[PDB]
A paper describes a structure:
In this paper, we present a strategy to fuse specific, high-affinity protein binders to obtain multivalent or multispecific scaffolds of predetermined geometry. DARPins are used as building blocks to confer the desired specificity to the construct. A series of rigid connector modules replacing the [name] capping repeats allow to combine the individual [name] domains in such a way that their distance and angle can be altered to test different geometries, bringing the binding partners of the DARPins into a defined spatial arrangement. The two helices are not just joined end-to-end, but instead the two domains are made to overlap in such a way that the joining helix is stabilized by contacts with the domain cores along its entire length.
Constructs off7_H09_3G124 (crystallized at pH 4.6) and off7_H12_3G124 (crystallized at pH 5.0) diffracted to 1.9 Å and 2.4 Å resolution, respectively. In these structures the ligands were lost from the complex at acidic crystallization conditions. In the off7_H09_3G124 structure, residues 141–156 are clearly visible in the electron density map, but the angle between the last helix of the N-terminal [name] domain and the H09 connector substantially differs from the design. However, this construct crystallized at pH 4.6. [name] repeats carry a conserved TPLH motif in the first helix of the N-cap5, 23, and protonation of the histidine residues in this motif reduces stability and weakens the binding affinity of the [name] moiety, leading to the loss of MBP and GFP from the ternary complex. Nonetheless, independent binding data at neutral pH strongly indicate that the conformation in solution must be closely similar to the design.
Author numbering: 8 to 322
The structure:
Amino acid sequence: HHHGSDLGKKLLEAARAGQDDEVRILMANGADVNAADNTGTTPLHLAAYSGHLEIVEVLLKHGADVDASDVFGYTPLHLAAYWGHLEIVEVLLKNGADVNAMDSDGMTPLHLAAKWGYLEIVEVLLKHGADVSAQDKFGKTPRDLARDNGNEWIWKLLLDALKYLLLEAAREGHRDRVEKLIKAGADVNAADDVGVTPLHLAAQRGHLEIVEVLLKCGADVNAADLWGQTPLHLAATAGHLEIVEVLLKNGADVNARDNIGHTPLHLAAWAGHLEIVEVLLKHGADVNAQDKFGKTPFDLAIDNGNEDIAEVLQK
């Protein structure tokens, strides 16, 4: 006998034709929701492609395999993303779909959403852990596919938004957001119009945890803003000694000059952070450095009455 096979075929065709009620009557009368045609296409594939959200939901509640792949390796999530069905994308992810499934060519759902500039879908995929730098067997990334189809400006908008959010998270000290943004593709070395990078902000506002994360992820420890200030300049001014150390342990230049000629020692002796001076001195800070006014860090320590600092600098 072959009643089960007969029901499966009728279900596939009812789904292929967008006959929601016919699909659900067949299901109610025993049709196998995990049936598949010659190409491995299942009913869930067809509902995800056609955008029939109600059918996607009931199929999943009836045990449809959310990650079923056809002969080319497409899952329902691949189709939902390629054909621009945001709600279905969200439902499949809620039901355990592999966000980073690969087809035979190695393309992920994020590849396909990026290709058409479906920004809302791109962002949900990244929120669920989509591999932002994934490459297919030919080395093409989601950004590459967007550019090839004239949608690069939409990917640049994504990156601009991630850049804004990373700077905000680094300035406000939100460790968890920083990590999730970096993993979603945020450029750790992005800078605003005045050359301030996330590391500048974290070091200035005293967010040690984020300084370590940014450096581990490749932030330039000696990046200079518009005024020539490195993160060590700002940390020395604000008085964050643990950050001063970390920056030095990661290769910060102790004698970096801003535009006025100030080294971190100029700024620390001025600010009155004695131990910072001692750490800088221990790390080879040049006590003889003169700024644009010909003044040394010793000259600045006097002008602030930090005789303890002006005494150790003498030694």
